[PDB]
Amino acid sequence: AKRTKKVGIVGKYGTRYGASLRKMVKKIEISQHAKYTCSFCGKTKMKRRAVGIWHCGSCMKTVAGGAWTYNTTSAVTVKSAIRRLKELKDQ
Template identity: 50%
Template structure:
């Protein structure tokens, strides 16, 4: 983690402050455990763009690109 820029530190000073902030918001959310729509447990991880898997009930489903809707 670099200062307050977090994972967007890899972009250095490029692309502008606001855009990096927006990317950081998305990256933080996509790494967090999401809530499963089937068993309601917070055990869902993002597998790929729009694909999520619940490690509790083992269901795989599609949703939004970065987080569960």
């Protein structure tokens, strides 16, 4: 059914911690708990291990990505910025 209107994942804290510190966790905490799509075997089994580490359910290939997510917004830029220096000047 519909069980809430404005908490979602942070209903487990309840009446505690405030309302702009449970608004802050609910974007990080659905992000760290979701199952991301594997860029190596197509499936969605990227279950987050300890912080930094990410790991497939199947094909068993462990990627060290973001901390609360999989792809850091800066590290998406960097991998597409390293290869910019790799073809310009050829080094």
